[PDB]
Amino acid sequence: DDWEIPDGQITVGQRIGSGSFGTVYKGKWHGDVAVKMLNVTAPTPQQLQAFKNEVGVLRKTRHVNILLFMGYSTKPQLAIVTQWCEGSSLYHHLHIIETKFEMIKLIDIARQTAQGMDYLHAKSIIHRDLKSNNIFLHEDLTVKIGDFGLATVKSRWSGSILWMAPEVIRMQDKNPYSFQSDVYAFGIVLYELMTGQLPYSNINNRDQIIFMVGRGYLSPDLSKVRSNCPKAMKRLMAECLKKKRDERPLFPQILASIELLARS
Amino acid sequence: DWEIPDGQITGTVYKGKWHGDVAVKMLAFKNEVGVLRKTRHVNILLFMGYSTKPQLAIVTQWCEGSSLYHHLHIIETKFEMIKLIDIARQTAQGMDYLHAKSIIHRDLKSNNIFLHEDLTVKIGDFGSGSILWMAPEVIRMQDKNPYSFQSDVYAFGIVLYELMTGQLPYSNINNRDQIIFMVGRGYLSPDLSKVRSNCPKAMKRLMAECLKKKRDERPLFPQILASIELLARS
Numbered sequence: 001d002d003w004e005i006p007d008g009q010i011t012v013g014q015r016i017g018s019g020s021f022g023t024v025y026k027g028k029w030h031g032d033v034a035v036k037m038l039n040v041t042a043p044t045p046q047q048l049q050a051f052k053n054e055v056g057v058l059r060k061t062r063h064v065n066i067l068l069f070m071g072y073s074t075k076p077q078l079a080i081v082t083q084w085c086e087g088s089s090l091y092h093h094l095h096i097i098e099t100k101f102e103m104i105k106l107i108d109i110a111r112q113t114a115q116g117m118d119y120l121h122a123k124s125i126i127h128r129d130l131k132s133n134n135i136f137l138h139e140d141l142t143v144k145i146g147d148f149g150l151a152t153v154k155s156r157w158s159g160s161i162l163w164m165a166p167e168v169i170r171m172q173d174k175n176p177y178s179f180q181s182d183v184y185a186f187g188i189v190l191y192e193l194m195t196g197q198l199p200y201s202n203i204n205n206r207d208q209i210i211f212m213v214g215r216g217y218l219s220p221d222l223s224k225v226r227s228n229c230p231k232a233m234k235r236l237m238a239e240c241l242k243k244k245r246d247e248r249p250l251f252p253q254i255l256a257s258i259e260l261l262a263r264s
Numbered sequence: 265d266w267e268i269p270d271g272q273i274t275g276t277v278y279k280g281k282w283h284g285d286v287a288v289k290m291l292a293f294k295n296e297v298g299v300l301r302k303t304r305h306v307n308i309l310l311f312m313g314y315s316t317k318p319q320l321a322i323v324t325q326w327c328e329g330s331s332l333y334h335h336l337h338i339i340e341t342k343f344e345m346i347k348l349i350d351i352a353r354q355t356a357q358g359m360d361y362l363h364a365k366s367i368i369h370r371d372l373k374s375n376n377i378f379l380h381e382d383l384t385v386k387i388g389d390f391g392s393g394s395i396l397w398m399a400p401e402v403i404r405m406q407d408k409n410p411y412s413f414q415s416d417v418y419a420f421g422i423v424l425y426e427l428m429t430g431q432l433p434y435s436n437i438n439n440r441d442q443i444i445f446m447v448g449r450g451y452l453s454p455d456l457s458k459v460r461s462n463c464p465k466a467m468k469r470l471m472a473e474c475l476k477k478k479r480d481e482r483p484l485f486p487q488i489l490a491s492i493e494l495l496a497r498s
């Protein structure tokens with residue numbers, strides 16, 4: 001199956017986001033696009049195949065709340081091409097430039113994020129790295145979820161611990177990821193949305209945050225939420241953040257909860 | 265210390281009278297009663313005391329009416345959907361409680377759900393001949409301990425089938441032992457296409473989640489409860 005973009009077609013503009021996993025630029029291909037170049041130097045035929053399989057999984061998605069896969073390139077560098085969103089991440093808005101969102105918009109961010117996640121889940125994809133860094137806000141104020149590609153490949157060939165549920169944080173199981181681990185991360189995003197800040201700010205040792213959340217000694221202080229946060233959401237958040245994996249709701253539930261209180 | 269002396273009350277249960285009408289269960293154990301004192305919820309059968317003169321016995325209220333089993337299958341009552349949903353929520357209310365108190369019911373079924381004044385639900389029998397409600401891990405008692413909160417969630421799911429179908433699952437297979445084998449290996453599950461037209465996707469979808477074969481994928485009761493509440497307000 002060929003969503004393969006022949007090299008020469010893509011002009012590669014300014015760089016937007018580094019990271020060992022790959023570097024992202026704004027480019028041109030039938031208009032604005034985002035091009036993510038992988039840092040894999042010389043992939044072998046096998047590495048090339050793993051990549052196409054993982055792309056295979058990217059082509060299972062078509063939803064307004066999922067950043068739009070448009071193509072991939074094989075030479076001279078492995079790359080993923082997606083739609084270009086004019087805007088900033090949720091992490092940028094919340095923690096870098098402190099954008100003040102009216103409560104109605106916060107909740108709407110939450111609705112749209114849950115929508116997209118329910119979609120991924122409907123298609124049996126697990127994100128493994130939902131964080132406010134991967135939630136983008138279009139100028140419209142449509143949310144796009146990103147960076148769910150290449151889960152397997154990222155592993156084989158670091159700053160997401162605030163979003164990791166305990167099972168994830170303590171690699172005991174070979175594969176600790178699941179829908180409810182995604183749901184936990186989403187809860188952390190709720191926390192960001194309604195406290196306006198990241199968890200565990202008053203603790204300064206990463207190794208120790210890792211230990212303590214991982215054993216259930218540490219969880220996010222929910223009393224920090226803004227006073228005009230609906231009670232139903234403080235509750236929902238709490239339930240997403242349950243330390244025990246099997247106590248966390250799935251996304252169809254979450255979505256209905258958030259859409260009911262979106263009428264009050 | 266909650267004992268009730270002899271000549272004050274009046275195998276299968278008999279009807280009695282102690283501080284009004286009571287149901288009295290006619291059969292080291294003293295450890296159990298400690299937990300039943302604090303088991304206090306509207307939709308759970310209320311514990312009023314124990315006895316051991318003559319034989320060891322548990323006493324609860326007598327509530328007028330009959331089991332969910334009795335209504336649905338024997339006398340076949342045509343409830344409204346709003347009622348069935350109401351009933352299913354109330355059953356969740358209690359199980360939710362019982363799990364809050366660390367109690368695995370181990371034997372939830374419709375004959376263990378009573379309708380007081382044909383209206384309010386009361387759970388009991390948490391102090392085989394009932395395979396229809398057993399989950400797979402349970403159905404093939406395979407190791408140290410097969411029971412779990414999730415095991416109960418499976419059985420509650422069968423009741424949801426009962427509620428909306430109005431009939432017992434596998435009603436078209438006459439060999440009990442085969443049903444055992446079949447649910448054990450994951451080959452046979454209840455036919456969800458037998459629900460009545462007017463059951464919302466959600467109810468039918470909740471049922472599915474409850475009846476998932478893998479133990480750990482089933483919801484726990486707060487969510488079942490929160491899900492029915494969500495579907496309730498339609």
Ligand SMILES: CN(C)S(=O)(=O)Nc1ccc(F)c(Nc2ncccc2-c2ncnc3nc[nH]c23)c1F
Nearest residue numbers: 017024034035036067080082084085146147148149
């Ligand atoms: C298939 N993709 C959705 S993904 O899951 O594999 N991730 C992904 C792949 C290639 C990409 F170019 C992007 N996009 C970005 N990734 C990291 C940082 C920023 C972006 C990005 N993408 C689109 N518009 C943007 N505007 C600012 N940053 C943007 C991605 F999120």
Ligand SMILES: CN(C)S(=O)(=O)Nc1ccc(F)c(Nc2ncccc2-c2ncnc3nc[nH]c23)c1F
Nearest residue numbers: 277287288289309322325326327328388389390391
């Ligand atoms: C905590 N108890 C409920 S229990 O788990 O120890 N089980 C139990 C013990 C004694 C009981 F009498 C009952 N209740 C009944 N058990 C069997 C048949 C009927 C009843 C029953 N209980 C209350 N009201 C009724 N009305 C008709 N049958 C009734 C029980 F459910």
